[PDB]
Each structure stands twice: as C-alpha cells, then as structure tokens.
Amino acid sequence: MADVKKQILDAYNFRHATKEFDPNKKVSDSDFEFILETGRLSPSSLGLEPWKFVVVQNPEFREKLREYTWGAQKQLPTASHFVLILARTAKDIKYNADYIKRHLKEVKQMPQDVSEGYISKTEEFQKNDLHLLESDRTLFDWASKQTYIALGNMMTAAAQIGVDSCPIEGFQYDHIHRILEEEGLLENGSFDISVMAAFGYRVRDPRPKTRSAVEDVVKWV
C-alpha cells in the first residue's frame, strides 16, 4: 500500500495546529462539505452520533467567542471556516432519553423489538460497565469523547486535501456556555460545547513536528 501510505503520512505531517490563516483564502463549498461529511460519517458509541457541527461564519459572532477563547486569538478572525462541535448532554444521551429512542428508530432503522433490548443493554452499560452515570458531567464527557473521533477525522481529511486546521480547547467554558445557550445553539439543553476547530489555509509553514518516540507510546503483549 506504499503510495497510499506515503500520501496519508504526508498529510499527517502537513496537519498542524495552525495559529493564523489567510483571511483571503476560503475553503471551497465542495471541500468544506467533504470535511463535514467525514464528521457525519464518523463512528460513535452505540451509534448515537451525539454531536452537532455548528459552522460559525458570522464575523460578529466569532468576535463574541474570541473574547473568551484565548486559544483562538488569530484563528477566529482569520479562519475560512470555524466549527463549534457540540456534544449531547445527559438530557438526551442518558439511556432512557427520547433522543436515543428516536435516533435508533428513525436514523438507525432499528426495529422496535430490537431497540427494547438495545436500550436495556445501553442502560446496563452506562450504569455498571463504564460508570457513565456517576454524574451528568460524566455522561456528557462520554458523548464528548465520541465528538473527538469526528474532530480527528475532519482535521485529517482536511489535511489530505490541502486544508489546514486547528483544534481548540482554549476557552472559558462558563462564558462560552452562556453565549451559546443565549444564542439558542444548545437547543434547550440538548447540547453543550465540546471542542472547537478552525479550518483554512496557512500563511507560513510551521517548525518541524514533534512527538514521542514510538517505543514510548506503543507496547506489545
């Protein structure tokens, strides 16, 4: 698979945490729809797809976010596209929530017979397997983990088509939460902010990428 592998690893080395984008270079509609598709097609635990990708293009709303997003001071103004990745809350992804039943039926096409058992399994899984019901936050964080699959996928896919990105956690939750809630974007408590991601074209190449040695992050048994 030598050619494919090289192309992919070149994209992994292309992708970096871009701090500033070219404000005059926009990702095409087609390319951005492809990036979003890699998010949409991502896998998720129990197939629940507990995410929403909010594409904030409005400059004024970006600036509202920027006040409380220390990690995106240049990324927010300059990005071609800027995404808030939301995750479902306990309201919607506790085992007995209506969202789960509707998703399994309407999206996953899971028969009613089958979903009864699947939701019973989900219940035991959340309570006793992974202890996800420890708190409402524990359960949100579980949903949020699924969103990080989508995050990783979207950034990598972007890089493979020559589009830079930057994942962003550097924000003040309390303030971002309020802003999104008041804007309506959390859908009556269905969602909360998980992670942000900018997309666009770099202005300068970065310094060489650094990572742990393979022997320090891989072990064979």
| Cα–Cα distance measured from residue 87 to residue 50, given in angstroms and rounded to the nearest whole number | 6
Residues paired with residue 166 on neighbouring β-strands, in sequence order? 198
Q: Smallest distance, Å, CB 15 to its own copies?
A: 7
Q: How far is CA 189 from each of CA 45, 82, 144, rounded to the nearest angstrom? A: 21, 22, 15
Total of residues contacting its own copies (CB under 8 A)? 83
Least distance (Å) between residue 82 CB and its own copies? 9
Distance, in Å, from the CA atom of 221 to the CA atom of 217, rounded to the nearest integer, reads: 13
Q: Is 166 in the site for ligand FMN (CB under 6 A)?
A: yes
Q: In the bound complex, what is the minimum distance in angstroms from residue 22's beta carbon to its own copies? A: 18
Structure token digits, residue 110: 């899971």
- 3-class secondary-structure state, position 191: strand
Q: Is residue 99 near its own copies by the rule CB under 8 A? A: no
The interface region with Mg ion, picked from 2-10, 96-104, 117-125, 130-138 by CB under 5 A, is 2-10
Sign, CA torsion 180/185/37/33: negative
User: According to the binding rule CB under 5 A, does residue 29 interact with Cl ion?
Assistant: yes
DSSP code at position 5: H
Specify whether the CB–CB gap between 170 and 43 falls below 8 A: no
Nearer to Mg ion, 79 or 186 (CB): 79
Residue 105 assigned as binding residue: no
Which of these ranges, 1-9, 57-65, 72-80, 94-102, lies near Mg ion under the rule CB under 5 A? 1-9
The interface region with its own copies, picked from 72-80, 112-120, 198-206, 207-215 by CB under 8 A, is 207-215
Residue 115 near ligand FMN by CB under 6 A: no
Quick one: which of 159, 142, 155 has its CA closest to 194? 142
Provide the H-helix boundaries in 84-194. Answer: 90-93, 98-102, 112-124, 136-160, 173-182
Determine which residue in the list 171, 179, 198, 199 makes contact with its own copies, applying CB under 8 A: 171
Residues that bind ligand FMN (CB under 6 A): 16-17, 19, 43-47, 71-72, 146, 149, 166-170, 195, 209
Residues that bind Mg ion (CB under 5 A): 3
- Binding residues for Mg(2+) are 3
Residues that bind Cl ion (CB under 5 A): 28-29
